[PDB]
Subunit: 49 residues, 2 copies
């Protein structure tokens, strides 16, 4: 049981780290995509407005 406790602790730690890294990468991709979609296309909307 003592050996299992620290292993479960490390498991939770690495799970949290993986979650954080995943969220960070997804955020980077979403930001780049929104910027590139707002700067390049959707221009007739500007002249219409």
């Amino acid at each position: 049981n003592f050996e299992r406790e620290r292993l479960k602790g490390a498991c939770d730690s690495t799970a949290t780290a993986y979650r954080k890294a995943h969220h960070h990468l997804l955020s980077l991709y979403a930001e780049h995509e929104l910027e590139h979609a707002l700067n390049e296309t959707c221009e007739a909307l500007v002249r219409a407005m």
Copy 2:
């Protein structure tokens, strides 16, 4: 001069009528264009946001 007076009155009248009609046409066109340009295109921005 009395004949010129009513002429200038009718001149201002037809001028303001033409101006109103032009503004109305331009407004209708701009509204239709904005609606048709927002409803159809600019959809990738929605998924980006």
